[PDB]
């Protein structure tokens, strides 16, 4: 029968490692780098697309940054195809929560549920795992600003600053060297650019290769605001830091 062709995607190695989870994590370490830094007055998300073409459209494009919610957003590293399937449940889940409790979903409860969906493909069903790592950046009336990461294993953790994708080891050490707690948002904006600029496998770090977002609570509106930087805005902020 079909027994012959079954890869057995949900088994342990003699070592006690999940083959498919490991090989999927290896896949992600090749995808474009994403960075999340959380400050005292907001959170920053940035990402780099792999290299692309001039012809490529940058205005309509939003491929690594996604809005999950009024107050939650995500950076993607891995297969976009896989990522959208999950992003769509994540959106449905938040709405379900809102329909039930008449309150916006707390950031962790959202993160946990996705990570539980991921864990599923790890334990039963004989299907392949989602080749996706997420950074989550959101706000709620309980913990305030939150930054999470989740990978194909279904494991999630909380961070002050984090990276997924390619060269995360190199990027983590650089953050671990320049990050401090009393940081302003616009200080964390600079850090994320510098970090990407130092791990870039390309010649130069240009606007057409970058995506940028902030989940900053307005210093006048006094409520939470999301902002996905449009090409022109990134072009402007890149001259400020000194990368032209």
């Amino acid at each position: 029968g079909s027994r012959r062709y079954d890869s057995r995607t949900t088994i342990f190695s003699p070592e006690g490692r999940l083959y498919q989870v490991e090989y999927a994590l290896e896949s992600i370490s090749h995808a474009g780098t994403a960075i999340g830094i959380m400050a005292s007055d907001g959170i920053v998300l940035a990402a780099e697309r792999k290299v692309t073409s001039t012809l490529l459209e940058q205005d309509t494009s939003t491929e690594k940054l996604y809005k999950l919610n009024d107050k939650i957003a995500v950076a993607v590293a891995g297969l976009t195809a896989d990522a959208e399937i999950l992003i769509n449940t994540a959106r449905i889940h938040a709405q379900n929560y809102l329909k039930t409790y008449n309150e916006d979903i707390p950031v962790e409860i959202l993160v946990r549920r996705l990570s539980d969906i991921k864990q599923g493909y790890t334990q039963h069903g004989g299907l392949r795992p989602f080749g996706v790592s997420f950074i989550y950046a959101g706000y709620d009336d309980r913990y305030g600003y939150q930054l999470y990461t989740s990978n194909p294993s279904g494991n999630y953790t909380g961070w002050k600053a984090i990276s997924v994708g390619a060269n995360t080891s190199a990027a983590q050490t650089l953050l671990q060297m320049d990050y401090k707690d009393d940081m302003k948002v616009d200080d964390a904006i600079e850090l994320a650019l510098k970090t990407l600029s130092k791990t870039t496998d390309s010649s130069a770090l240009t606007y057409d290769r970058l995506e940028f977002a902030t989940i900053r609570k307005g210093a006048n509106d006094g409520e939470v605001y999301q902002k996905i930087f449009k090409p022109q805005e990134i072009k402007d902020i890149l001259v400020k830091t000194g990368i032209t």
């Binding site: 949900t10 088994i11 006690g16 539980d116 671990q176």
Partner: protein, 241 residues
């Protein structure tokens, strides 16, 4: 749909997938549990590999199953969330059909039963998790400590540890824990816990997390400040000699 037998017997008589699930536990961070005269203490280690974390929101290693019973684990974190959840649901069901919170033995037996069930159902792999379940039975002031493992086997321990280097800490407890006279104080029982983890983890302010469960649903996790004081005293014990 998918029912392929993943956990099966081998020529010599082993279920390889369960043995490999144990190996996942052996890789997990160290977890310890010791019971005193009037309490149970739970100790866990936190990795140093990546150090830009957020302990406010990162799940803690010790979780409440009910107001009176806690569960710690060693192994795959993602797998643990499934076990914890089922256990919490059964805690509520139990209060609802019996009008009484769960006994530690019962709750343990149900976590053990799930684990077993994944070792002889088609299409699933065993849980890469061993658990330590601790607490006090309703209206009872006798401390309880139980250990479960991927095979679904469970039993009670005066003291036990699981995870990486649990051999090192188990050897420590086997010579330091007296069954005749258990740790009489809450304070005395915390010291014995920290001392045992200090064999494995390297001078851990952040590296050791302690949770104390007392009779009648009195569960209170210890801060980095309090634990720090124990370690400060413990390392001064050696130098006097």
């Amino acid at each position: 749909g998918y029912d392929r037998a993943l956990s099966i017997f081998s020529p010599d008589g082993h279920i390889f997938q369960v043995e490999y699930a144990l190996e996942a536990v052996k890789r997990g961070t160290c977890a310890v549990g010791v019971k005193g005269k009037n309490c149970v203490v739970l100790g866990c280690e936190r990795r140093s590999t990546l150090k830009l974390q957020d302990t406010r929101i990162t799940p803690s290693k010790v979780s409440k199953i009910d107001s009176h019973v806690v569960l710690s684990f060693s192994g795959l974190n993602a797998d643990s969330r499934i076990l914890i959840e089922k256990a919490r649901v059964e805690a509520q069901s139990h209060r609802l059909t019996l009008e009484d919170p769960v006994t530690v033995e019962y709750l343990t037996r149900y976590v053990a039963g799930v684990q077993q069930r994944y070792t002889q159902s088609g299409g699933v792999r065993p849980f890469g998790v061993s658990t330590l379940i601790a607490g006090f039975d309703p209206r009872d002031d006798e401390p309880k400590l139980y250990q479960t493992e991927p095979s679904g086997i469970y039993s009670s321990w005066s003291a036990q540890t699981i995870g990486r280097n649990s051999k090192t800490v188990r050897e420590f407890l086997e010579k330091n824990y007296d069954r005749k006279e258990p740790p009489a104080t809450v304070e005395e029982c915390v010291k014995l816990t920290v001392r045992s983890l200090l064999e494995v983890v390297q001078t851990g302010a952040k590296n050791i997390e302690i949770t104390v469960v007392k009779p009648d649903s009195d569960i209170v996790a210890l801060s980095s400040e309090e634990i720090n004081q124990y370690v400060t005293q413990i390392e001064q014990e050696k130098q006097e000699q």
